[PDB]
Write an enzyme that holds these catalytic residues in place. Structure first.
Site, PDB file in Angstrom:
ATOM      1  N   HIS C  88      27.850  33.001  10.489  1.00  0.00           N
ATOM      2  CA  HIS C  88      28.041  34.149   9.583  1.00  0.00           C
ATOM      3  C   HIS C  88      26.988  34.100   8.487  1.00  0.00           C
ATOM      4  O   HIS C  88      26.363  33.043   8.264  1.00  0.00           O
ATOM      5  CB  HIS C  88      29.449  34.131   8.974  1.00  0.00           C
ATOM      6  N   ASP C  91      24.749  40.090   3.545  1.00  0.00           N
ATOM      7  CA  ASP C  91      23.736  41.112   3.155  1.00  0.00           C
ATOM      8  C   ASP C  91      24.407  41.937   2.043  1.00  0.00           C
ATOM      9  O   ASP C  91      25.441  42.503   2.257  1.00  0.00           O
ATOM     10  CB  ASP C  91      23.336  41.990   4.354  1.00  0.00           C
ATOM     11  N   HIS C  93      23.829  45.119  -0.210  1.00  0.00           N
ATOM     12  CA  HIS C  93      22.996  46.327  -0.409  1.00  0.00           C
ATOM     13  C   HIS C  93      22.545  46.470  -1.866  1.00  0.00           C
ATOM     14  O   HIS C  93      21.617  47.304  -2.135  1.00  0.00           O
ATOM     15  CB  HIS C  93      23.785  47.552   0.017  1.00  0.00           C
ATOM     16  N   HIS C 128      28.018  43.049   3.573  1.00  0.00           N
ATOM     17  CA  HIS C 128      28.558  42.813   4.933  1.00  0.00           C
ATOM     18  C   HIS C 128      27.836  41.663   5.618  1.00  0.00           C
ATOM     19  O   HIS C 128      26.715  41.303   5.220  1.00  0.00           O
ATOM     20  CB  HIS C 128      28.523  44.071   5.785  1.00  0.00           C
ATOM     21  N   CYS C 129      28.485  41.109   6.646  1.00  0.00           N
ATOM     22  CA  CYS C 129      27.882  40.077   7.495  1.00  0.00           C
ATOM     23  C   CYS C 129      26.856  40.797   8.393  1.00  0.00           C
ATOM     24  O   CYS C 129      27.050  41.977   8.725  1.00  0.00           O
ATOM     25  CB  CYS C 129      28.998  39.381   8.261  1.00  0.00           C
ATOM     26  N   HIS C 139      30.325  42.036  13.893  1.00  0.00           N
ATOM     27  CA  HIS C 139      30.930  41.319  12.762  1.00  0.00           C
ATOM     28  C   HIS C 139      31.429  42.351  11.730  1.00  0.00           C
ATOM     29  O   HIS C 139      32.495  42.148  11.136  1.00  0.00           O
ATOM     30  CB  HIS C 139      29.985  40.312  12.111  1.00  0.00           C
ATOM     31  N   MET C 144      34.081  42.261   8.495  1.00  0.00           N
ATOM     32  CA  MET C 144      33.240  41.451   7.544  1.00  0.00           C
ATOM     33  C   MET C 144      32.411  42.389   6.656  1.00  0.00           C
ATOM     34  O   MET C 144      31.184  42.518   6.815  1.00  0.00           O
ATOM     35  CB  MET C 144      32.331  40.441   8.245  1.00  0.00           C
ATOM     36  N   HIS C 249      39.648  62.461   0.086  1.00  0.00           N
ATOM     37  CA  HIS C 249      40.349  63.573  -0.565  1.00  0.00           C
ATOM     38  C   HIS C 249      41.671  63.048  -1.148  1.00  0.00           C
ATOM     39  O   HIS C 249      42.386  62.317  -0.471  1.00  0.00           O
ATOM     40  CB  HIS C 249      40.584  64.681   0.460  1.00  0.00           C
ATOM     41  N   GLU C 273      36.894  68.786  -4.323  1.00  0.00           N
ATOM     42  CA  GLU C 273      38.111  68.741  -3.488  1.00  0.00           C
ATOM     43  C   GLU C 273      37.993  67.492  -2.594  1.00  0.00           C
ATOM     44  O   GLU C 273      38.967  66.735  -2.467  1.00  0.00           O
ATOM     45  CB  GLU C 273      38.378  70.039  -2.686  1.00  0.00           C
ATOM     46  N   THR C 274      36.891  67.379  -1.888  1.00  0.00           N
ATOM     47  CA  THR C 274      36.643  66.352  -0.872  1.00  0.00           C
ATOM     48  C   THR C 274      35.229  65.864  -1.077  1.00  0.00           C
ATOM     49  O   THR C 274      34.345  66.676  -1.375  1.00  0.00           O
ATOM     50  CB  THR C 274      36.863  66.933   0.543  1.00  0.00           C
ATOM     51  N   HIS C 300      39.562  63.195   5.127  1.00  0.00           N
ATOM     52  CA  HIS C 300      39.981  64.559   5.494  1.00  0.00           C
ATOM     53  C   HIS C 300      39.420  64.989   6.871  1.00  0.00           C
ATOM     54  O   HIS C 300      39.388  66.207   7.133  1.00  0.00           O
ATOM     55  CB  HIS C 300      39.699  65.563   4.396  1.00  0.00           C
TER      56      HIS C 300
END
Ligand SMILES: OC[C@H]1O[C@@](CO)(O[C@H]2O[C@H](CO)[C@@H](O)[C@H](O)[C@H]2O)[C@@H](O)[C@@H]1O
Ligand SMILES: OC[C@H]1O[C@@](CO)(O[C@H]2O[C@H](CO)[C@@H](O)[C@H](O)[C@H]2O)[C@@H](O)[C@@H]1O
Ligand SMILES: OC[C@H]1O[C@@](CO)(O[C@H]2O[C@H](CO)[C@@H](O)[C@H](O)[C@H]2O)[C@@H](O)[C@@H]1O
Ligand SMILES: OC[C@H]1O[C@@](CO)(O[C@H]2O[C@H](CO)[C@@H](O)[C@H](O)[C@H]2O)[C@@H](O)[C@@H]1O
Ligand SMILES: OC[C@H]1O[C@@](CO)(O[C@H]2O[C@H](CO)[C@@H](O)[C@H](O)[C@H]2O)[C@@H](O)[C@@H]1O
Ligand SMILES: OC[C@H]1O[C@@](CO)(O[C@H]2O[C@H](CO)[C@@H](O)[C@H](O)[C@H]2O)[C@@H](O)[C@@H]1O
Ligand SMILES: O=N[O-]
Ligand SMILES: O=N[O-]
Ligand SMILES: O=N[O-]
Ligand SMILES: O=N[O-]
Ligand SMILES: O=N[O-]
Ligand SMILES: O=N[O-]
Ligand SMILES: O=N[O-]
Ligand SMILES: O=N[O-]
Ligand SMILES: O=N[O-]
Ligand SMILES: [Cu+2]
Ligand SMILES: [Cu+2]
Ligand SMILES: [Cu+2]
Ligand SMILES: [Cu+2]
Ligand SMILES: [Cu+2]
Ligand SMILES: [Cu+2]
Lengths: 341, 341, 341
Positions: C88, C91, C93, C128-129, C139, C144, C249, C273-274, C300
């Protein structure tokens, strides 16, 4: 009678047209009265005559566009006639509280209810049926969705202090449908919505629609039902999708001003090729036509547009502008002296 | 000769590279002359050697990037050699009228046509073939799409009065492919596009691609074809998708300035992790590299990135900055005195 | 000891809750120390008791939310206990270089590693892995993934010079799962992640999840685990999706301020709304509750929300505001004198 405002009854019209309204108003807030009648019925949804067991507000997919102004109150009478088989309700994404009104509007066949909501948020918004649990997606993808537009009292603006005014408005409701097929691949028919449910739910679970249509059927807004406009007109196109994302595009045009999230408190984006309506929302685009002729309005997944039903046409009258575009040389034989590697 | 402007012939280059151009210019508007030659051919699209019946502009997926400035006229000669089997045309999303030019450019094998369009809208835009009806999605997902960039005459800006200048530009065309399989799951081969059509259309209808590739094949921009850059360079990455949404991400980097809807009249967003290219559009991201090494550029549906082909590499030369990132302790045995619950 | 800053150990908590932090701070930059322990385990992911072979950071899907301020350094100890079967890594971002740290953090069972990254970019970000190749999506869709929030030192603002402060924060991690089925359609069980891989990869390749869940299982944030709030509270809802798009939403509410791309250097949108979380990103929404009762928080795509697991509940205490919404007339028989055509 706690709320002491003038009342105005609105008569809804069938999409893609929109009931009479004012863009900018100097009237004060009113109670705007609307009536929506649920109608379960078999409907034709493609050019080969495929039917399916629809559930609608006011007999149309989408349901009609409601237009009010910021600070109005919206008093909606929802009617579920005793010819219907299922309970229904309504959720306004424009509204605050009680699951958009769904928690206050559940009605059995034979019943009606009256909900009032204050229009505190500007923009275009989805409304849809949402009975509870698995019935929510089923009623929505069976056709029970529409939109409401809450205009600023001063009308639209470009987010930079300039008024925008439309000459024409159309409401394009996009619907994703999930029609069961038999072992040979032919679409199945049913005698009631209840009979269609189990097979329909199996299609729904794989998240791939069989049809994606504007105004309730493939070809609804093509041919004799093309949308009219004229060179120079500023046209507002309201687009809703209650369940699934869409990517509108006006072939041969642009979005001059686009609210892709659909909310007029945000400045529009300018000069878009293609915009994005997130599932569960409405958006709006303004375009001023510059050329006459046929325009296709599509979702720009072109498989959905051309093969699953999601193409509308505009027919635009006026004079061609050769400065913006011209055919310099018509199709002709490739010259003998050409090298084309 | 109504239009009395200087003419400049442009020689297109193969993606991901871009023909020579100026960012900011003080030249007046010109007639910018481009030639696109349709080429139907079998192409390899994955690392196991899967072939498919492609249709291309200028022999590449994507078609080449065209670069002009706001107010130029773009005069395109589209050529359909007699070795081809199908009619073809071109639709510029940058253009106004006649379905983007598709209604003025339909040519049979053996023919050519010349279209002129005025570049009135700034940004990056899709161009694609669109013959009519079901042929539209088929030609586009067979490879007949590219992009054009219309720069402001003053070059790019940050929407807040500061000029932006790129040191390098790459065009990443993403293509969704729909390759038929036999009953055992193996990809089928055909001798012509026409022979592949019926089976391909069945795959297309289920809206799930078999492959999602950059520059026409899995692995095209990895290994010896990785994209070069240097620490400190501002790199513009233009990304197009003519049919299906994408979510670009530079692994180990960011988008410093991102026009995800692709239109330079709108201020870019800053400091994005992942951005969104709506199907039927192009977008653009600027990033200034701060660290050397390998970067993966992906669509951040990682199944598509790793398993369906949609990964590119940048190889970036320079010196490592331990202030931004460092390995404090290399991999080592978990200490005996540790408690890791 | 090149980097001479104060060090602060943070104790992570399980989602949807978030560890203690300051919104605005006048402390200088610190080295913020976090520990993440990989745990492979079978987990229940739906209300019928379906299990699957999960891989997690700190035993939860999502992994915990990490919160720091712009200019802090983040020193992460990643531990892979010898009870685990696979290598494992991690990362971020939010980080710059070495594939987000993945290229510096690959650890076998029995090993740990320490990575430091400078928090130079504000917003919410996925971590995330990403071991390499096809292991990356596997993964991530095995669980993960998590998020980190990098706050401005002055806290949040509305992009127009006004401070925003939340009373409460929740982290909603959305996970798309790909559970194999047998020939009868029943979900398959396996004794290890390795045993599940081949069948899982076949499901992954068709890009249609079997489940879409919040906080690791259908129903996780409903019933007794509903999210609490009070009328008047400003609640920040952080939403991540490491692999697939989502469209959040709040049913009966709105997003007052929404960073849908998740980066605080960009002004939020108002009154949505969304909203839209692109796969491989995190976003954030602020809402001030105005009405008491139950709210559903959904993606939604209502099929995913109701039928594949992606619904959370808020339970909001306070007094009902009849001005914003009221039931004018409770459900009642349709009057005899009515005409409802
Ligand atoms: O702009 C953010 C804002 O939304 C608020 C407005 O102050 O309220 C919205 O909903 C309220 C419902 O009464 C109204 O005040 C307002 O007119 C509407 O846009 C807040 O809750 C918040 O600051
Ligand atoms: O789509 C599967 C398969 O079914 C057939 C009938 O056997 O056609 C059906 O599906 C078509 C595509 O949706 C429709 O055009 C038509 O109305 C329907 O009967 C085959 O033709 C097709 O391969
Ligand atoms: O910004 C909105 C604007 O688009 C307009 C510009 O006034 O026109 C666009 O297309 C026209 C084509 O001639 C040009 O005026 C302009 O330079 C271009 O951006 C209008 O139709 C509208 O206000
Ligand atoms: O994908 C279905 C099934 O087909 C097989 C061949 O029987 O492999 C094919 O599909 C793979 C995934 O797309 C490709 O990797 C390969 O080129 C192709 O032959 C099986 O291996 C697979 O389960
Ligand atoms: O706003 C664009 C900007 O991002 C920059 C800031 O100048 O840097 C970002 O990453 C850098 C990493 O050191 C920092 O300067 C900065 O604080 C952060 O937002 C440039 O590379 C570029 O102009
Ligand atoms: O979904 C296909 C098919 O499988 C069955 C079992 O034969 O049910 C399974 O799939 C359901 C939907 O995902 C789950 O509700 C359940 O846990 C699972 O066994 C059929 O009932 C269904 O048609
Ligand atoms: O009150 N006048 O329109
Ligand atoms: O049936 N709808 O327009
Ligand atoms: O009301 N649901 O069928
Ligand atoms: O006209 N000068 O570049
Ligand atoms: O074949 N395209 O780069
Ligand atoms: O031109 N269409 O095959
Ligand atoms: O330095 N004071 O919080
Ligand atoms: O297991 N996750 O909350
Ligand atoms: O580390 N991959 O299984
Ligand atoms: Cu209903
Ligand atoms: Cu809804
Ligand atoms: Cu073509
Ligand atoms: Cu197009
Ligand atoms: Cu892992
Ligand atoms: Cu990532």
């Amino acid at each position: 009678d706690d709320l002491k405002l003038p009342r105005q009854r609105v008569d809804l019209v069938a999409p893609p047209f929109v009931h009479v309204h004012e863009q900018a108003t100097k009237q004060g807030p009113k109670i705007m009265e609307f009536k929506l009648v649920v109608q379960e019925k078999k409907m034709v949804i493609d050019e080969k005559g495929t039917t399916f067991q629809a559930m609608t507000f006011n007999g149309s997919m989408p349901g009609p566009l409601m237009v009010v102004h910021e600070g109005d109150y919206v008093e909606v009478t929802l009617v579920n006639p005793a010819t219907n088989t299922m309970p229904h309700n309504i959720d306004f994404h424009s509204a605050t509280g009680a699951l958009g009104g769904g928690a206050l509007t559940l009605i059995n066949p034979g019943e009606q209810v009256v909900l009032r909501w204050k229009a505190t948020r500007t923009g275009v918004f989805v409304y849809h049926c949402a009975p509870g649990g698995p019935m929510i997606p089923w009623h929505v993808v069976s056709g029970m969705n529409g939109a409401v537009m809450v205009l600023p009292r001063d009308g639209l603006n470009d987010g930079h202090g300039h008024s925008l005014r439309y000459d024409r408005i159309y409401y394009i409701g996009e619907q994703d449908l999930y029609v069961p097929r038999d072992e040979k691949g032919n679409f199945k028919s049913y005698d009631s919505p209840g009979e269609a449910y189990s097979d329909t739910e199996e299609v729904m679970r794989k998240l791939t629609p069989t049809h994606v249509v504007f105004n309730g059927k493939a070809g609804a807004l093509t041919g004799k039902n093309a949308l009219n406009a004229n060179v120079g007109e500023n046209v507002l196109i309201v687009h809703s999708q209650a369940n699934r994302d869409s990517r509108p595009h006006l072939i041969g045009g642009h979005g001059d001003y686009v609210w892709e999230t659909g909310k007029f408190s945000n400045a529009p984006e300018t000069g878009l090729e293609t915009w994005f309506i997130r599932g569960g929302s409405a958006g709006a685009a303004l375009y001023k036509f510059l050329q006459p002729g046929i325009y296709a309005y599509v979702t720009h997944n072109l498989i959905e547009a051309a093969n699953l039903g999601a193409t509308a046409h505009f027919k635009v009258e006026g004079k061609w502008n050769d400065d913006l575009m011209t055919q310099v040389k018509a199709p002709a034989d490739i010259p003998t002296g050409s090298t084309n590697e």
